Write an enzyme that holds these catalytic residues in place. Structure first.
Site, PDB file in Angstrom:
ATOM      1  N   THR A 185       6.061   1.161  -2.294  1.00 15.67           N
ATOM      2  CA  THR A 185       6.471   1.631  -3.611  1.00 15.67           C
ATOM      3  C   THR A 185       7.044   0.489  -4.443  1.00 15.67           C
ATOM      4  O   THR A 185       8.154   0.019  -4.192  1.00 15.67           O
ATOM      5  CB  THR A 185       7.516   2.759  -3.510  1.00 15.67           C
ATOM      6  OG1 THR A 185       6.955   3.869  -2.802  1.00 15.67           O
ATOM      7  CG2 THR A 185       7.947   3.212  -4.898  1.00 15.67           C
ATOM      8  N   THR A 186       6.274   0.041  -5.434  1.00 14.36           N
ATOM      9  CA  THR A 186       6.690  -1.038  -6.318  1.00 14.36           C
ATOM     10  C   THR A 186       6.280  -0.706  -7.744  1.00 14.36           C
ATOM     11  O   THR A 186       5.128  -0.342  -7.997  1.00 14.36           O
ATOM     12  CB  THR A 186       6.078  -2.380  -5.893  1.00 14.36           C
ATOM     13  OG1 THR A 186       6.510  -2.708  -4.566  1.00 14.36           O
ATOM     14  CG2 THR A 186       6.507  -3.488  -6.844  1.00 14.36           C
ATOM     15  N   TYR A 188       5.868  -1.378   2.618  1.00  7.11           N
ATOM     16  CA  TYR A 188       5.885  -0.121   1.878  1.00  7.11           C
ATOM     17  C   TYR A 188       5.141  -0.194   0.552  1.00  7.11           C
ATOM     18  O   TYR A 188       5.003   0.834  -0.117  1.00  7.11           O
ATOM     19  CB  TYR A 188       7.330   0.323   1.634  1.00  7.11           C
ATOM     20  CG  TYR A 188       8.078   0.660   2.904  1.00  7.11           C
ATOM     21  CD1 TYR A 188       8.017   1.935   3.451  1.00  7.11           C
ATOM     22  CD2 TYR A 188       8.844  -0.296   3.559  1.00  7.11           C
ATOM     23  CE1 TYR A 188       8.696   2.249   4.611  1.00  7.11           C
ATOM     24  CE2 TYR A 188       9.528   0.009   4.721  1.00  7.11           C
ATOM     25  CZ  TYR A 188       9.451   1.284   5.243  1.00  7.11           C
ATOM     26  OH  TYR A 188      10.128   1.598   6.398  1.00  7.11           O
ATOM     27  N   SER A 189       4.664  -1.371   0.157  1.00  5.37           N
ATOM     28  CA  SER A 189       3.890  -1.541  -1.062  1.00  5.37           C
ATOM     29  C   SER A 189       2.448  -1.859  -0.698  1.00  5.37           C
ATOM     30  O   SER A 189       2.188  -2.714   0.156  1.00  5.37           O
ATOM     31  CB  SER A 189       4.477  -2.648  -1.938  1.00  5.37           C
ATOM     32  OG  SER A 189       5.773  -2.304  -2.391  1.00  5.37           O
ATOM     33  N   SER A 206      11.039  -0.609  -3.822  1.00  5.30           N
ATOM     34  CA  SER A 206      11.422  -1.214  -2.550  1.00  5.30           C
ATOM     35  C   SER A 206      11.159  -2.716  -2.543  1.00  5.30           C
ATOM     36  O   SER A 206      12.097  -3.516  -2.474  1.00  5.30           O
ATOM     37  CB  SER A 206      10.672  -0.544  -1.396  1.00  5.30           C
ATOM     38  OG  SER A 206       9.274  -0.750  -1.505  1.00  5.30           O
TER      39      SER A 206
END
Lengths: 197, 235, 232, 246, 213, 201, 226, 234, 216
Positions: free
Chosen positions: F1-2, F169-170, F130
């Site tokens: 998540t970015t 997470y990205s 994140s």
């Protein structure tokens, strides 16, 4: 932990605010202005938890603007901090306690330029100079040495550079850009923004 | 005279004239008729248009799959009871997961109708309600009044010029039980003939009907399916 | 509490209570206002006091904000409640939205109150009619009139109070593109608009002006006489 | 309930006015004659006492003259019962102001605060309006010495001199004639009240007991208010006693 | 003391074909390591074109089912029309946020036909987020079914292989075998499989048995 | 998540990824974080996904309300201003929402950052999420105030590439949205993995 | 829920104007403030010899140093007793001191002001005489139905108060002993009350340095020697 | 005054509501139009002075992209109802993510109109009925729909309904000219002919306001361009 | 909330035209077995019944609410009766609101019913879990009697009152062995077309001979 500082001269009140708003390891906006204007001769500077600064400042700001319209004149600097303290004290025990540490500056035709210190518990105090945050350790001790009640506003800013440079040297957090303003009987006067190229 | 001002004041003959005039407003509007057999029940509503340019008003309000109602009286006064009646039927299936009984619903609607009556300042509902429904005991025709009184009837005609309509219903009442769904609509539409003068009688455009039955949920018909229902009948 | 309907209908359909409210509007002093080119100017006549009253409380030309000001003609009673609660909306709008107030936004919330007071239980319609005038974004002025009934209009030149129709006759006839050309001709028009309903009043005319970014400015009595000195 | 007996104060007359408010101004005229004067050295307040009997006492400071706060005072003419309601509400508004700003309330702010409460009952609520007319004196940081008059309709205004109650047309006429604007001060203008109170009172031989006088003057940065000595007011009347001969 | 919800297991997977949408889930309902019953259909038909399974705590599924149907028929009588498959999505999303402070624990997957006639799938989460996708899963076995979904439907990680649009015959092979494979290794899936297919005519539902353990 | 966006003379470019995961397990690779508000207003998503959906749609209502009210096409600064208010009502009740505000008005292509507590920050260059920390470094190496629209996308692409590369997470695929006077336009939806061979050699 | 008190065309209050008219039609009541104490004398008239005198008293104490009498509607006075006594206790909570006479009658008359304003409630048909002793100063006050309380050295009310005031214009002097003031008030009611004059019909009470004390019929019989 | 609001007449009518429908005869003449190709609404501004700006006064406002408005009688009574009508319209899309149908628009307004009452309620309730005659048009997937509403609160689907002072002879005239498939441009013709005949003032772009709604074209307020064309194309 | 009168296992099984429900008469306070005589089973009109587990205190309150609700329809004489579904529907919804208010009634209930030849049996939980199964157990009976029932249900899905109750007699026989909180007294309630028929307290003959086989 953002840093505020202010100094009250006999004819003037010098205020300085760090412009850096950071989150975690990065600076969100490094030039963001924390200085807010209550009225023509009375400003306000706040620091604390992020959302509490912006939000709660509008309360005192907009409500004082309503006062001038009814009675035709602005509040006094003393009435300002008073009105600021009770509103912060009434909301202190409420469901949403605010974390903010604010310096209140202003001018009056009798009391002259005034500076009022306030903590996050809304404890009002009248001091010639005061600061907020962890930087008050590395700075206000220098002012105790070089301050005199007769100090001119010119040597004020000249003296403030000695306290601000210690923030870049010993103090860990960056705070590259500083905002400087001064208030007198002629109104607000903006000054240079101190930076280290 | 001085006794007609509100509901609380009683006449020296022991009559509330506001409730009396509430029944008068029901006679001031479109006449509807409904009837039930041992199986199917039909509600024949007479739609009336103010002018020919304006279309006909909607006299039928769909309540539930097993329940339907026709309105005769002040138009918008039924909207308050409509949304209430619909909310009560939804709350029955929302909790019990069962359709609310027809006799139990009308008993609850008659309660909400009577409450504002005795309390000063609240206007009594000036619209009459002819409601029908089907349950395990068969169809039911329940006619109400602005006084909150409600009865159980084989066939009933309310509204203006319903006299000759009721007389037709009484003599033919013996047939209304034994007739099938097709003959219920026929004699049901011919009963609406007596509610209007000898010039304008009946058309498929201004007359809508609805039916509920054993395995058939309550439905509403207006023009298309009503045309074969009317045609093929002598008047 | 007190719960009943006040204003009710009539066999002819007109409202008894509301018509008597607008009657008290005309019974008040004559107030005028116009929308100038780059500015706005308000004015109202002063009943002549004899060597007594102070002009601080008597002034009928107020300011709701730096952008918008107002004047009123009617019962002085209900005028002060509207001025107070409208200034609350001006600060509440700036509290809710960082952008400044809009003359049309503040005006509707004002007349909307009088509409609520008419249809609310136990309340009363006001006997005041206020002229809401101010500056919009880019500097475009706006002049709006309220109504005790709750409606609001838009006016280029307007007159309220006693003889409002009489001054309106002078308006419609003498209002042209020649009117409100410049700050001087705008003020002289307001003075002449108060010369029809004045009987030997003279200096009783007080004026006010709002110039661009600046907030409402009150013309001194000598500054008023400067523009009044030219009549013939 | 019984709308038959409901007077409905909120109803406008066919003339476009209020029934109760119009009858309220007349009830004030039946009350005692009270006047006030705004001078350079301070404010002047004098009030007649219409109650005259040998059994009267008046243990209080004054009858129709009350003290609002440190910096302000008031007089009254009208219904004597509803006056205590307005007096308490003025003391509540002034002290609640001291909470927030920790400063004395200015004269104009305290007056307009109660007038909103006065007319709030004429706007709605169905309760009868107030038949009390109040005079206001005091000093504020900005405008200084001030004199204010209020009306039962909620309207008010500033005044250099005025009179309330009975003989309003005669007194105010006699006031303007000799009134010196921004000139005649407490000492001198105090002789005018005694001169006016003697003319307004139809019974001759004006008595110091039948009238009451109180002044408010800020001196040395401190507001000073007092009720004038009746023994001195007698000598102040002894001045007027020798005025017609010389 | 008191836990607001407990994980009951269960798995729901819905694939949307070109003009059709297939929704299949088991009937197995359990609490922790304890089994309730082997017939507990998750898929609940609402309207003709709308059928919705709910994977998660089973008690919260019924309350939503009643509140939905409460709004459905209320929408019907008031608005004189049925809700489209896309309309129920945004509706239930607002229903979930009203309870945000007491979150419903469920995985909601909407399926049916859209206004254009194509199969639509809307996957939700306990906090109320929503999205549209061709194939979704839910529950415990949802983690184990993704590689088989990214292969047959996804066509990822192969070298120069034609991409064929999915068909009903492949879906019946796919959707069953992925459950046949999941019911084996995952303890929370098995004992039966129900399939809900909705076409332009109406719903078509059938049941196929799985391994009994 | 970015999630990252930055303001420049030619308007604003919004660059986010498509992967929103629950824990270490990936929920869906194709999740669309960017949310539509108005033709000229574009929203973002960070933290809780449902909190971004609801409030920006509630703001989309508020954006329509005032537009159905005064028809003034409310300014971008007032948007986040109205968003700050509604968020400060429930402040302390557990709402965690990161997001950004993009739009064009008479002032210009306004860019604003909104926090969970109501913090309202304008500025030239933002980022959040994140793995946002990996974005600042590659984005802050070189800058031209006036961006060429093509190389501006490359500066936005290469950012997301190496950002999502270091962060676990990205990931997923690239989402890119340019901002214009009349209305925004979606530039491309592109896989992250195949963009490596370009930069890799 | 609506106040029936309105302004007459002459400005008078019609409901309160008839309130005092009911007060004047009741039993006579007088009072005198002289020397170190204040006396209150009332006349209790039963309808027969079958009604107990000592059961209900018109003179009632409020606090130690304060007492009240009345002339008017009986039941309306019982409401004021509960509200006056309860108000004095709320005073003793805050300031922990006995209530002064000026403070009491103020807020007690405020209850009269509330019911002449708030809707749906009629004004009071009673008028009370206030007797109190505080800090060595005797306090005799008179309240009306409208709520206006005045200060009086002596006063008369109820029936035949015009002749009662005439007696106070003569029989009442200064530096008058409290004991002589009691017999003076008896001479005031001598003309008003007719028939058989006994100690049970008249009800007298006083307040002094020792506090408010009601007099017993046995003591009154000694005070009837005149 | 010697009568109540809810008091029934001996003929079965309400004193209050009867004068409501009796009060609307003094309003401004306006006519709605429902065509197979869209919905058309026209209204007379009725400006009492050149200083009064006809552009600021708007008797037709946009609730949703489909639905327009109409006003007659007391203007502020309509503004009060349209405010809450626009709130519930966006509350529809806030939930179902779709545009509110023309029928559901009048259902929300009919509920707000039926709540009229005084006793046994809160002070924030409307005590007396509105003197406005409402016309709500719009076009959706169901097609063009035009509804009529009076102070009673009912809504009925109708091709054309006349409101205002001239509604007596206009509604009978709208019946004669409008029939069958007659479209937008042909509707504006007969609209401006009947309106100009009944009103005192002659037809002008600033004396009246006109707007239409189409399936492909949402609510479009006619500016000086479209207004000056249709008045000379009459 | 507190350890108040905790209950035991609750067993039920469908058969032809009826439902068998069985529960122990033992109330249990904490680890102590305290009240050995209580009424677990209530008759609801003719065709329906209720029995519960968990907190017996909180049950009597909700047990009393059903009684007042049944009176409502009996006073009308509408010619209808509450179905086991609707009662199971009302119970699931009523106990549900207790969870949202953070004051849940702690119970596990079973509803038997007979409607038009189709016998309904249902299960509910404190948290609101509800379904329908031919064999329902509560607590550790779900770990003991439940597999024994499903072992027989495979070979004999259709059962009469004969083997049903006789199997339930064998079900609670194990509840002595491996369930420590069970007790000798139990009730057998059978719902048929004639209405609810609740037999009195009964006992069970068990075989402990496993004890003497240890020394072998």
């Amino acid at each position: 932990m953002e840093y505020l500082i202010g100094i009250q001269g006999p004819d003037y009140v010098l205020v300085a605010s760090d412009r850096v708003a950071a989150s975690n390891i990065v600076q969100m906006k490094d030039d963001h202005d924390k200085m807010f204007k209550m009225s023509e001769k009375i400003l306000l500077l706040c620091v604390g938890e992020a959302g509490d600064t912006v939000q709660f400042a509008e309360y005192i700001q907009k409500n004082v603007q309503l006062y001038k319209m009814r009675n035709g004149y602005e509040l006094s600097p003393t009435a300002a901090a008073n009105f600021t303290r009770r509103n912060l004290a009434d909301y202190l025990r409420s469901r949403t306690p605010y974390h903010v540490n604010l310096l209140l500056a202003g001018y009056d035709e009798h009391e002259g330029p005034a500076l009022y210190y306030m903590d996050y518990l809304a404890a009002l105090a009248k001091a010639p100079f005061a600061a907020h945050g962890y930087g008050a350790f590395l700075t206000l001790s220098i002012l105790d040495r070089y301050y005199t009640p007769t100090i001119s506003r010119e040597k004020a800013v000249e003296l403030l550079r000695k306290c601000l440079e210690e923030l870049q040297k010993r103090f860990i957090l960056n705070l590259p850009t500083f905002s400087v303003r001064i208030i007198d009987r002629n109104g607000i006067h903006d000054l240079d923004n101190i930076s280290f190229p | 005279n001085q006794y007609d001002n509100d509901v609380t004041v009683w006449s020296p003959q022991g009559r509330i004239h506001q409730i009396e005039y509430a029944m008068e407003a029901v006679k001031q509007g479109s006449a509807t008729v409904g009837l039930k057999s041992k199986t199917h029940a039909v509600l024949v509503a007479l739609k009336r248009a103010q002018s020919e340019l304006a279309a006909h008003q909607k006299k039928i309000l769909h309540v539930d799959n097993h329940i339907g109602i026709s309105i005769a009286g002040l138009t918008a006064d039924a909207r308050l009871l409509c949304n209430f009646m619909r909310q009560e039927c939804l709350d029955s299936r929302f909790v019990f997961d069962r359709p609310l009984p027809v006799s139990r619903l009308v008993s609850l609607i008659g309660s909400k109708t009577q409450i504002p009556t005795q309390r000063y300042g609240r206007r009594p509902y000036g619209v009459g309600l002819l409601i029908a429904g089907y349950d395990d005991m068969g169809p039911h025709i329940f006619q109400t009044c602005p006084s909150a009184n409600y009865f159980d009837c084989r066939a009933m005609s309310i509204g203006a010029r319903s006299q000759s309509a009721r007389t037709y219903l009484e003599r033919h009442m013996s047939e209304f039980m034994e007739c099938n769904l097709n003959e219920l609509v026929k004699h049901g539409l011919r009963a609406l003939r007596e509610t209007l003068p000898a010039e304008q009688d009946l058309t498929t455009k201004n007359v809508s009907i609805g039916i509920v039955g054993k395995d058939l949920e309550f439905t509403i018909y207006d023009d298309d399916d009503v045309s074969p229902f009317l045609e093929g009948l002598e008047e | 509490s007190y719960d009943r309907a006040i204003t009710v209908f009539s066999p002819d359909g007109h409202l008894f209570q509301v018509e008597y409210a607008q009657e008290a509007v005309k019974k008040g002093s004559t107030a005028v206002g116009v929308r100038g080119k780059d500015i706005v100017v308000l004015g109202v006549e002063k009943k002549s006091v004899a060597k007594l009253q102070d002009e601080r409380t008597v002034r009928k030309i107020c300011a709701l904000d730096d952008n918008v000001c107002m004047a009123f003609a009617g019962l002085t009673a209900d005028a002060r409640i509207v001025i107070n609660r409208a200034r609350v909306e001006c600060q509440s709008h700036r509290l809710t939205v960082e952008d400044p107030v809009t003359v049309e936004y503040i005006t509707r919330y004002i007349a909307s109150l009088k509409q609520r007071y008419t249809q609310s239980n136990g309340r009363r319609p006001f006997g005041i009619s206020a002229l809401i005038v101010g500056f919009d974004f880019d500097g475009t002025p706006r002049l709006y009139q309220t109504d005790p009934s709750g409606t609001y209009h838009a006016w280029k030149a307007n007159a309220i109070g006693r003889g409002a129709k009489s001054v309106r006759e002078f308006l419609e006839k003498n209002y042209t593109d020649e009117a409100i050309e410049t700050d001087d001709l705008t003020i002289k028009l307001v003075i002449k608009a108060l010369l029809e309903v004045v009987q030997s009043g003279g200096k009783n005319i007080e004026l006010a002006v709002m110039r661009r970014d600046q907030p409402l400015k009150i013309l001194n009595p000598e500054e008023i006489e400067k523009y009044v000195a030219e009549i013939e | 309930m019984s709308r038959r007996y409901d007077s409905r104060t909120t109803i406008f007359s066919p003339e476009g006015r209020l029934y109760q408010v119009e009858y309220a101004m007349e009830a004030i005229g039946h009350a005692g004659t009270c006047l006030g004067i705004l001078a350079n050295d301070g404010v002047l307040l004098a009030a007649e006492r219409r109650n005259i009997h040998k059994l009267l006492d008046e243990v209080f400071f004054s009858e129709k003259i009350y003290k609002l706060n440190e910096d302000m005072a008031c007089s009254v003419a009208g219904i004597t019962s509803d006056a205590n309601v307005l007096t308490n509400e003025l003391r509540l508004i002034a002290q609640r102001y001291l909470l927030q700003y920790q400063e004395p309330i200015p004269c104009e702010q305290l007056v307009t605060a109660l007038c909103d409460i006065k007319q709030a009952y004429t706007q709605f609520g169905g309760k009868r309006p107030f038949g009390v007319s109040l005079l206001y004196i005091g000093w504020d940081k900005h405008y200084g010495f001030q004199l204010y008059q209020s009306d039962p309709s909620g309207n008010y205004g500033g005044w250099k001199a005025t009179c309330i109650g009975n003989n309003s047309a005669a007194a105010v006429s006699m006031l303007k004639q000799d009134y010196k604007e921004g000139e005649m001060t407490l000492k001198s203008a105090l002789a005018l009240a005694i001169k006016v109170l003697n003319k307004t009172m139809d019974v001759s031989k004006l008595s110091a007991e039948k009238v009451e006088i109180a002044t408010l003057t800020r001196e040395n940065g401190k507001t000073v208010i007092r009720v004038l000595k009746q023994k001195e007011v007698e000598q102040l009347i002894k001045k007027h006693e020798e005025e017609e001969a010389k | 003391r008191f836990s607001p919800y407990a994980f009951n297991g269960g798995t729901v997977l819905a694939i949307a074909g070109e003009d059709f949408s297939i929704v299949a889930s088991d009937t197995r309902l359990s609490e922790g390591f304890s089994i309730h019953t082997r017939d507990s259909p998750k898929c609940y038909k609402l309207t003709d074109k709308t059928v919705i399974g709910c994977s998660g705590f089973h008690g919260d599924c019924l309350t939503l089912t009643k509140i939905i149907e409460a709004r459905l028929k209320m929408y019907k009588h008031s608005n004189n029309k049925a809700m489209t498959t896309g309309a129920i999505a945004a509706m239930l999303s607002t229903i979930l946020y009203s309870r945000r402070f007491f979150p419903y624990y469920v995985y909601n997957i909407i399926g049916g036909l859209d206004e254009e006639g194509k199969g639509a799938v809307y996957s939700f989460d306990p906090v109320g987020s929503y999205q549209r996708d061709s194939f979704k899963a839910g529950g415990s076995a949802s983690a184990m079914l993704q590689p088989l979904l990214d292969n047959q439907v996804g066509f990822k990680n192969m070298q120069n292989v034609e991409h064929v649009p999915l068909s009903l015959d492949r879906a019946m092979r796919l959707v069953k075998d992925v459950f046949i494979s999941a019911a084996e290794r995952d303890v929370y899936t098995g004992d039966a499989l129900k399939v809900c297919i909705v076409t332009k005519e109406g719903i078509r539902g059938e049941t196929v048995p799985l391994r009994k353990d | 998540t970015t999630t990252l966006a930055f303001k420049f003379q030619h308007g604003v470019i919004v660059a986010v990824d498509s992967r929103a995961s629950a824990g270490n397990y990936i929920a869906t690779l194709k999740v669309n974080k960017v949310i539509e508000i108005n033709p000229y207003l574009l929203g973002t998503m960070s933290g809780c996904a449902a909190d971004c959906l609801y409030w920006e749609r509630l703001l989309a209502k508020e954006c329509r309300l005032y537009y159905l009210r005064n028809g003034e096409r409310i300014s971008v600064s007032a948007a986040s201003k109205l968003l700050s208010n509604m968020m400060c009502q429930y402040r302390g009740m557990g709402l965690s929402m990161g997001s950004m505000i993009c739009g064009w008005d008479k002032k210009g292509p306004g860019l604003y950052y909104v926090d969970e507590n109501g913090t309202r920050l304008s500025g030239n260059m933002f980022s959040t999420g994140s793995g946002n920390s990996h974005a600042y470094g590659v984005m802050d190496s070189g800058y031209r105030p006036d961006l060429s629209i093509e190389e501006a996308y490359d500066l936005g692409r290469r950012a997301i590439v190496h950002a999502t590369h270091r962060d676990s997470y990205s990931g997923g695929v690239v989402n890119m949205y340019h901002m214009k006077e009349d209305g925004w336009v979606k530039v491309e939806s592109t896989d992250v993995s195949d963009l490596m061979h370009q930069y890799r050699e | 829920s609506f106040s029936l008190t309105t302004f007459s065309p002459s400005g008078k209050l019609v409901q309160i104007e008839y309130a005092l008219a009911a007060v004047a039609g009741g039993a006579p009541s007088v009072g005198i403030k002289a020397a170190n104490g204040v006396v209150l004398a009332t006349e209790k008239k039963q309808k027969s010899i079958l009604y107990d005198e000592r059961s209900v008293h018109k003179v009632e104490p409020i606090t130690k140093h304060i007492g009240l009498v009345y002339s008017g509607m009986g039941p309306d006075y019982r409401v004021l007793v509960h509200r006056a006594r309860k108000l004095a206790q709320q005073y003793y909570l805050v300031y922990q001191e006995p209530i002064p006479t000026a403070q009491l009658v103020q807020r007690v008359a405020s209850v009269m002001q509330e019911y002449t304003q708030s809707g749906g409630v009629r004004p009071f048909g009673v008028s009370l005489l206030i007797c109190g002793w505080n800090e060595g100063r005797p306090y005799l006050f008179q309240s009306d139905p409208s709520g206006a309380y005045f200060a009086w050295k002596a006063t008369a009310m109820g029936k035949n108060y015009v002749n009662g005031k005439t007696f106070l214009e003569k029989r009442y002097n200064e530096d008058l002993e409290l004991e002589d003031a009691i017999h003076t008030a008896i001479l005031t009611l001598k003309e008003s009350f007719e028939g058989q004059m006994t100690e049970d019909n008249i009800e007298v009470g006083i307040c002094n340095e020792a506090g408010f004390r009601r007099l017993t019929p046995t003591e009154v019989k000694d005070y009837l020697a005149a | 005054y010697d009568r109540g609001v809810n008091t029934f007449s001996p003929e079965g009518r309400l004193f209050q509501v009867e004068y409501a429908i009796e009060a609307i005869k003094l309003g401004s003449t306006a006519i709605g139009i429902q065509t197979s190709e869209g919905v058309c609404l026209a209204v007379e501004k009725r400006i009492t002075s050149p200083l009064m700006e006809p552009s600021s006064i708007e008797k037709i406002v946009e609730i949703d992209a489909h639905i327009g408005c109409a006003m007659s009688g007391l203007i502020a009574d309509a503004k009060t109802l349209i405010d809450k009508a626009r709130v519930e319209t966006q509350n529809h899309w806030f939930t179902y993510n779709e545009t509110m149908t023309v029928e559901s628009v009048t259902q929300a307004v009919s509920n707000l109109a039926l709540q009229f009452g005084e006793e046994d309620a809160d002070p924030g309730a409307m005590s007396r009925p509105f003197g406005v005659a409402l016309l709500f048009g719009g076009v959706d997937e169901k097609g063009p729909q035009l509804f009529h509403m009076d102070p009673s609160g009912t809504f009925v689907q109708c091709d054309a309904r006349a409101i205002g002072s001239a509604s007596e002879g206009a509604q009978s005239s709208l019946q004669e000219v409008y029939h069958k498939s007659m479209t937008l441009k042909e509707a504006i013709k007969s609209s401006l002919i009947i309106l100009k005949q009944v009103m005192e003032e002659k037809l002008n772009a600033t004396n009246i306001e006109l707007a239409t709604v189409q399936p492909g074209q949402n609510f479009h307020m006619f500016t000086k361009e479209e207004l000056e064309e249709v008045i000379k194309d009459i | 909330q507190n350890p108040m009168v905790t209950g035991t296992s609750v067993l039920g099984l469908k058969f032809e035209g009826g439902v068998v429900i069985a529960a122990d008469m033992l109330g249990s306070y904490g680890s102590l077995a305290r009240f050995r005589n209580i009424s677990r089973i209530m008759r609801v009109n003719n065709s329906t019944m209720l029995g519960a587990s968990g907190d017996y205190a909180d049950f009597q309150y909700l047990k009393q609410v059903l009684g007042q609700m049944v009176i409502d329809e009996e006073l009308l004489g509408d010619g209808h009766s509450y179905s086991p579904k609707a009662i199971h529907s009302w119970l699931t919804r009523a106990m549900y609101s207790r969870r949202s208010k953070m004051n849940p009634l702690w119970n596990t209930m079973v509803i038997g019913g007979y409607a038009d030849g189709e016998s309904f049996l249902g299960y509910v939980d404190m948290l609101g879990v509800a379904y329908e199964a031919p064999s329902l157990a509560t607590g550790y009976g779900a770990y003991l009697a439940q597999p024994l029932l499903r072992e027989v249900l495979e070979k004999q899905p259709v059962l009469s009152q004969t083997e049903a109750r006789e199997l339930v007699e064998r079900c609670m026989r194990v509840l002595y062995y491996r369930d420590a909180r069970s007790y000798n007294r139990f009730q057998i309630a059978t719902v048929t077309e004639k209405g609810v028929e609740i037999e009195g307290p009964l006992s069970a003959e068990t075989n402990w001979d496993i004890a003497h086989m240890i020394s072998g």
